[PDB]
């Protein structure tokens, strides 16, 4: 299977400019394109991407178009310029996935054996991490469903490359509060609490919503399973979890005595140098 | 910039397997000379702190010679 | 010759295509075409970049396959934006980026099709983090050396051109070449979502995950590097207490005597990492 | 065929001679340290398909 996918900034900007391509027709069009990459390992690599023609109307909303010939000749171009590069999958704009978002993979499984998708968001209202990626597997159920063919998410991030470092890290010039040390992580320390909160808000909204609508949706397998997983691991016990706190005292201990000893001595030594060069230049100046 | 230590010692230090495959008992009857080369080379390689306590000043370089063969 | 104001616009995708394709084929100068829109007299706006295919295994040699032109522009016609070609690019990967003889050779043949089709040079080597280095040029004739060459409207651009700059040979190639300013306009949507990516996606998914992993570090792995820290902060210290003694001994603060220093500040910052991630323990683990 | 072989020669006239050297050792994933046989040492890089 896949360990995780590694998305580079170039493909995300190659989605943003694609939305700028089709932003003039406006009327009813999602962004859909084709993903390029490199199957490196169990981890996955992504280098390039490009467009595709695609449309979808209102009545009988299963009307969808993937030009094979565009794929053939333009993949011939990209293979002609780079032989290291080959196809790994596809992408679209992804507000979410709708019902028709299986047929694209079910077309191009005959190109990549595991045709992986990428769900992004061109509108950065997402205070989470963009570039979601699914992969389609089968999980055939105890109820005797014949074949449930469900996309499943494998985790994702934004990777690094030496030239794209030069690119991105020059294109920002905007914000740098880090001074990387005890405080490059505290902004993200607000982020981890707040972005557990957003996900939990989605959780409670979903839980309240399943009782009202979906007719009896409630997830029927993975509600009671993973809910009891939740209800099996909030350890708040008090027998030796209290007794981790002399190890907490030990955590305090080392840093207290390192700070208290060496910080004062170094600052004092600098005071020595400052006051020597202060008075010995004072007697020569005045 | 500074470099890490490098710049081949004709390859470097034989690295894995370029041993001559000669054992101790293969040499016959060289007891004073084998023992002296041992105490001059192999012994200060390990028991370094005995020299600092006894006050021996173990040597730096050793020289062998003799007729060819 | 008769000049205008010197100004080149960009697209944000352009620079990335430039660096990627000029890096992936680095020791040979990689041909690439450039695509955009001639808006007016003095500004040129590149909006799209597609790279050219390579050929035989030799430096600086370049070609424009017209069936590649037809098919690529045809795909960009069935892509959302068809537009006009505006020039081309390659790299000068090992040097201070001047157009070579082959470059001016393809320029005098390419200039008969477009007037201000600007030749651009990316370099993925002489830029590290605070340089693009974007470097574009413009060819001069030889017929108009009877006439002058010097109207140069909006004078600031020329005096700006002479500062990013070095050589004896660029100084020898102020003839045949006069550059043109390049600047950058950024979508605040794109700026803010690149900020999302590179101030949020360097934090990882669900955002609790790696900070609770630091909490996993703080009771299993930290004590080993705490032992390393304590051994350093004994061994370095008993000889850096010789240091103010010898400051009193030698002089009032003269030149650097020898190797070592205090270096304790870095080890203390690692200890600060220890304490901050130990503070993370209560916050994450409880509730 | 004279024009063909001599046009192959015409295309081939633009090749460049290349320095012959030996590699001392590998510094990093991209930094390589070689020695030119006529003289000095250098610090070089590779291609992407090597
Ligand atoms: Zn060149």
Curated annotation (Swiss-Prot), chain A:
Residue intervals of the MPN domain: 5-140
Cited InterPro entries: EIF3F/CSN6-like_C (IPR024969), JAMM/MPN+_dom (IPR000555), MPN (IPR037518), MPN_RPN7_8 (IPR033858)
Positions of modified residues (N6-acetyllysine): 200, 210
PROSITE patterns named in the record: MPN
RNA-binding recorded as keyword: no
SMART domains: JAB_MPN (SM00232)
GO molecular function, one term: protein homodimerization activity
Coiled coil residues, start to end: none
The organism's place on the tree of life at top rank: Eukaryota
Cross-link (Glycyl lysine isopeptide (Lys-Gly) (interchain with G-Cter in ubiquitin)): 176
Biological process, per Gene Ontology: proteasome-mediated ubiquitin-dependent protein catabolic process
GO cellular component: cytosol; extracellular exosome; extracellular region; ficolin-1-rich granule lumen; membrane; nucleoplasm; nucleus; proteasome complex
Keywords linked to the UniProt accession: Acetylation, Isopeptide bond, Proteasome, Ubl conjugation
Keyword Nucleotidyltransferase carried by entry: no
SUBUNIT field: Component of the 19S proteasome regulatory particle complex. The 26S proteasome consists of a 20S core particle (CP) and two 19S regulatory subunits (RP). The regulatory particle is made of a lid composed of 9 subunits including PSMD7, a base containing 6 ATPases and few additional components. Within the complex, PSMD7 interacts with subunit PSMD4 through their respective MPN domain. Interacts with TRIM5.
Note: Does not bind a metal ion.
Similarity-based family: Belongs to the peptidase M67A family.
Protein name, per record: 26S proteasome non-ATPase regulatory subunit 7
UniProtKB/Swiss-Prot annotation, chain B:
Homology family: Belongs to the AAA ATPase family.
Biological source species: Homo sapiens (Human)
Functional summary from the UniProt entry: Component of the 26S proteasome, a multiprotein complex involved in the ATP-dependent degradation of ubiquitinated proteins. This complex plays a key role in the maintenance of protein homeostasis by removing misfolded or damaged proteins, which could impair cellular functions, and by removing proteins whose functions are no longer required. Therefore, the proteasome participates in numerous cellular processes, including cell cycle progression, apoptosis, or DNA damage repair.
Subunit composition and interactions: Component of the 19S proteasome regulatory particle complex. The 26S proteasome consists of a 20S core particle (CP) and two 19S regulatory subunits (RP). The regulatory particle is made of a lid composed of 9 subunits, a base containing 6 ATPases including PSMC4 and few additional components. Interacts with NR1I3. Interacts with PAAF1. Interacts with TRIM5. Interacts with ZFAND1.
Protein name, entry field: 26S proteasome regulatory subunit 6B
Top-rank taxon, per record: Eukaryota
Location in the cell: Cytoplasm; Nucleus
Transmembrane spans: none
Residues of the full protein shown: 141 to 209 of 418
UniProtKB/Swiss-Prot annotation, chain C:
Motif range (JAMM motif): 90-103
Binding positions (Zn(2+)): 90, 92, 103
Root EC class: hydrolase
Presence of the UniProt keyword Protein biosynthesis in the record: no
Residues found modified as Phosphothreonine: 243
One GO cellular component, as annotated: proteasome complex
Tissue expression pattern: Widely expressed. Highest levels in heart and skeletal muscle.
Modified residues (Phosphoserine): 127, 201
Gene3D superfamilies registered for this protein in UniProt: Cytidine Deaminase, domain 2
Keyword Magnesium annotated: no
S-S bonds: none
Pfam family, one: RPN11_C
UniProt EC number: 3.4.19.-
Gene Ontology biological-process annotations: double-strand break repair via homologous recombination; double-strand break repair via nonhomologous end joining; proteasome-mediated ubiquitin-dependent protein catabolic process; protein deubiquitination; protein K63-linked deubiquitination; regulation of proteasomal protein catabolic process; response to ethanol; ubiquitin-dependent protein catabolic process
Function statement: Component of the 26S proteasome, a multiprotein complex involved in the ATP-dependent degradation of ubiquitinated proteins. This complex plays a key role in the maintenance of protein homeostasis by removing misfolded or damaged proteins, which could impair cellular functions, and by removing proteins whose functions are no longer required. Therefore, the proteasome participates in numerous cellular processes, including cell cycle progression, apoptosis, or DNA damage repair.
Protein name: 26S proteasome non-ATPase regulatory subunit 14
Protein source organism: Homo sapiens
UniProtKB/Swiss-Prot annotation, chain D:
Localisation: Cytoplasm; Nucleus
Domain of life: Eukaryota
Modified residues (N6-acetyllysine): 35
Region forming the signal peptide: none
Complex and partners: Component of the 19S proteasome regulatory particle complex. The 26S proteasome consists of a 20S core particle (CP) and two 19S regulatory subunits (RP). The regulatory particle is made of a lid composed of 9 subunits, a base containing 6 ATPases including PSMC6 and few additional components. Interacts with PAAF1.
Homology family: Belongs to the AAA ATPase family.
Main function: Component of the 26S proteasome, a multiprotein complex involved in the ATP-dependent degradation of ubiquitinated proteins. This complex plays a key role in the maintenance of protein homeostasis by removing misfolded or damaged proteins, which could impair cellular functions, and by removing proteins whose functions are no longer required. Therefore, the proteasome participates in numerous cellular processes, including cell cycle progression, apoptosis, or DNA damage repair.
Protein's recorded name: 26S proteasome regulatory subunit 10B
Gene label: PSMC6
């Amino acid at each position: 299977a896949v360990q995780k996918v590694v998305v580079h900034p170039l493909v995300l900007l190659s989605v943003v400019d694609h939305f700028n391509r089709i932003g003039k027709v406006g009327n009813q069009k999602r962004v859909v394109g084709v993903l390029l990459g490199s199957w490196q390992k169990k981890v996955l690599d992504v280098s390039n991407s490009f467009a595709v023609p695609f449309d979808e109307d209102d009545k009988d909303d299963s009307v969808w178009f993937l030009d094979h010939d565009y794929l053939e000749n333009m993949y011939g171009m990209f293979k002609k310029v780079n032989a290291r590069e080959r196809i790994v999958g596809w992408y679209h704009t992804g507000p979410k996935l709708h019902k028709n978002d299986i047929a694209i993979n079910e077309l191009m499984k005959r190109y990549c054996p595991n045709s992986v998708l990428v769900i992004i968001d061109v509108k950065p209202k997402d205070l989470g991490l963009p570039t979601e990626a699914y992969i389609s597997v089968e999980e055939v159920h105890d109820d005797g469903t014949p074949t449930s063919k469900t996309f499943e998410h494998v985790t994702s991030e934004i990777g690094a490359e030496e030239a794209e470092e030069v690119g991105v890290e020059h294109l920002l010039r905007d914000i740098k509060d880090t001074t990387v040390g005890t405080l490059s992580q505290r902004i993200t320390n607000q982020v981890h609490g707040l972005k557990g909160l957003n996900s939990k808000l989605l959780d409670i909204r979903s839980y309240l919503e399943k009782v009202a609508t979906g007719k009896l949706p409630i997830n029927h397998q993975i509600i009671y399973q993973l809910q009891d997983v939740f209800n099996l691991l909030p350890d708040v016990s008090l027998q030796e979890f209290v007794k981790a706190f002399y190890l907490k005292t030990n955590d305090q201990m080392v840093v207290v005595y390192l700070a208290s000893l060496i910080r004062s001595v170094v600052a004092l030594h600098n005071l020595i140098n400052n006051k020597i060069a202060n008075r010995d230049a004072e007697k020569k100046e005045g | 910039d500074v470099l890490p230590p490098e710049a081949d010692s004709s390859i470097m230090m034989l690295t894995s397997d370029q041993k001559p495959d000669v054992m101790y008992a293969d040499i016959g009857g060289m007891d004073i000379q084998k023992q002296e080369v041992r105490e001059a080379v192999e012994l200060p390689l390990t028991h370094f702190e005995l020299y600092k306590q006894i006050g021996i000043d173990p040597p730096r370089g050793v020289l062998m010679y003799g007729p060819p063969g | 010759a008769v000049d205008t104001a010197e100004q080149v616009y960009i697209s944000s995708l352009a620079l990335l295509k430039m660096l990627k394709h000029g890096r992936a084929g680095v020791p040979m100068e990689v041909m690439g075409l450039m695509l955009g829109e001639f808006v007016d007299d003095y500004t040129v706006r590149v909006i799209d970049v597609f790279a050219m295919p390579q050929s035989g295994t030799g430096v600086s040699v370049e070609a424009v396959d017209p069936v590649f032109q037809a098919k690529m522009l045809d795909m960009l016609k069935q892509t959302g934006r068809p537009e006009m070609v505006v020039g081309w690019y390659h790299s000068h990967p090992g040097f201070g980026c001047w157009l070579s003889g082959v470059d001016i050779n393809t320029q005098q043949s390419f200039e008969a099709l477009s007037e201000r089709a600007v030749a651009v040079v990316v370099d993925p080597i002489q830029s590290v983090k605070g340089k693009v280095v974007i470097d574009a040029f413009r060819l001069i004739n030889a017929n108009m050396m009877v006439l002058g060459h010097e109207p140069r409207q909006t004078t600031s651009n020329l005096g700006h051109l002479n500062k990013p700059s070095i050589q004896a040979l660029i100084h020898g190639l102020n003839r045949h070449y006069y550059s043109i300013t390049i600047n950058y306009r950024k979508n605040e949507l794109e700026q803010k979502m690149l900020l999302n990516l590179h101030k949020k996606s360097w934090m990882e998914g669900l955002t609790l995950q790696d900070y609770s992993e630091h909490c996993k570090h703080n009771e299993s792995v930290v004590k080993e590097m705490l032992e390393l820290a304590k051994n350093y902060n004994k061994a370095v210290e008993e000889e850096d207490k010789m240091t103010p003694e010898q400051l009193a001994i030698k002089n009032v603060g003269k030149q650097d005597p020898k190797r070592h220093l205090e270096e304790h500040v870095d080890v203390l910052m690692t200890s600060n990492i220890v304490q901050c991630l130990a503070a993370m323990l209560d916050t994450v683990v409880f509730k | 065929k004279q024009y063909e072989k001599s046009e192959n020669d015409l295309k081939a006239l633009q090749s460049v001679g290349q320095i012959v050297g030996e590699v001392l050792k590998q510094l990093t994933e991209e930094k390589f340290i070689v020695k030119a046989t006529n003289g000095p040492r250098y610090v070089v890089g590779c291609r992407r398909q090597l």
